[PDB]
């Protein structure tokens, strides 16, 4: 769980409190302040399957 600290609505990238998330990771947009559930992608961590 976390909350979207910032997300660019037009370009589809952002950060979740921090871990990166882009629009393809969402299951179209996130907005600042939302609470989400995601997997970590530590292949600078990144989010996956964001709810």
């Amino acid at each position: 769980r976390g909350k979207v600290k910032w997300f660019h609505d037009y370009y589809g990238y952002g950060f979740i409190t921090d871990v990166f998330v882009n629009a393809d990771a969402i299951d179209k947009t996130l907005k600042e302040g939302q609470v989400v559930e995601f997997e970590i992608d530590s292949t600078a961590p990144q989010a996956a399957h964001v709810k």
Partner: protein
């Protein structure tokens, strides 16, 4: 080094949408956009004061940052934010100034100069010099050491700091101890563009099309391309300018433009240090605390300022 991993993630998503239509992009359109940079960590300082600086014909907002644990008389940096002479303000660069103050051990005055196309060239240049003069003449009121006042800035703001140093040389003051130029746009002969202008023209946030768009907004005509208040590298006599520190980024179209200014300063007998940050792009200071490479690099730039004004 390869691209910093966090920056890489941003760029990969940025470059999925096509480039803007620069022939019809308006400034009011571009400013209505959401900015590419998110708000980043604000380092703590002793005090931040915002006020209006009254100049003939216009008022400029100023933010003054006093860091913890420094005693008067203070060294100071007059700082001009970047943004292609069209965007940016005190808040977009507030986290940058806080790092420069806290780790540079200096009072920072961040100056809100007038923006194009509403105020075309040379409005920002006049603002940049007139604001330095306003502050330097009040050094005693601000408890500053008049022998340790620097100028600095990023991107278009580094342009303004470099040009301000030239105007101060011409006008016999005020005394500038140091110029801190962070990936600055100091110009070049348009017939011989430095390699990075074409090598890094696409893919790294600041693009060749964006650069031409900023210039069209800022300048009255392209005949001003070689005016030294726009391209200070072409100023005929750079001797006697303040010593400089120049930071460039490896993946910046302006990388070899900064290198060209260092070469020109060095050949005119001015002390200059230049450092290229091999893993970063243009504008990396605004990724502070978010990108580990950007964080390390901005802290190093701030320590260069500290050493210069010690």
């Amino acid at each position: 080094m390869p691209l910093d991993p966090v920056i890489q993630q941003v760029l990969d998503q940025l470059n999925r949408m096509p480039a803007p239509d620069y022939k019809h992009l308006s400034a009011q359109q571009f400013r209505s956009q959401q900015s590419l940079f998110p708000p980043v960590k604000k380092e703590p300082v002793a005090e931040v004061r915002e006020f209006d600086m009254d100049l003939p014909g216009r008022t400029l907002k100023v933010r003054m940052y006093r860091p913890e644990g420094v005693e008067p008389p203070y060294p100071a940096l007059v700082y001009y934010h970047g943004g292609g002479w069209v965007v940016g303000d005190l808040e977009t660069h507030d986290p940058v100034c806080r790092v420069l103050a806290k780790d540079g051990r200096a009072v920072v005055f961040s100056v809100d100069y007038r923006l194009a196309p509403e105020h075309k060239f040379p409005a920002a240049v006049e603002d940049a010099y007139d604001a330095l003069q306003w502050i330097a003449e009040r050094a005693a009121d601000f408890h500053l050491d008049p022998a340790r006042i620097a100028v600095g800035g990023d991107s278009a703001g580094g342009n303004l700091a470099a040009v301000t140093s030239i105007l101060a040389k011409e006008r016999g003051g005020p005394a500038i101890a140091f110029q801190l130029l962070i990936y600055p746009s100091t110009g070049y002969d348009p017939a011989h563009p430095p390699a990075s202008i074409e090598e890094n023209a696409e893919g790294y946030l600041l693009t060749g099309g964006m650069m031409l768009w900023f210039r069209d907004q800022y300048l009255n005509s392209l005949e001003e391309l070689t005016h030294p208040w726009f391209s200070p590298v072409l100023y005929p006599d750079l001797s006697g300018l303040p010593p400089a520190y120049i930071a460039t980024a490896q993946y910046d179209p302006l990388r070899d433009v900064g290198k060209l200014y260092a070469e020109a300063l060095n050949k005119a007998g001015v002390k200059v240090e230049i450092e290229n940050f091999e893993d970063l792009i243009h504008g990396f200071a605004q990724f502070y605390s978010l990108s580990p490479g950007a964080t390390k690099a901005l802290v190093r730039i701030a320590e260069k300022l500290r050493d210069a004004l010690a």
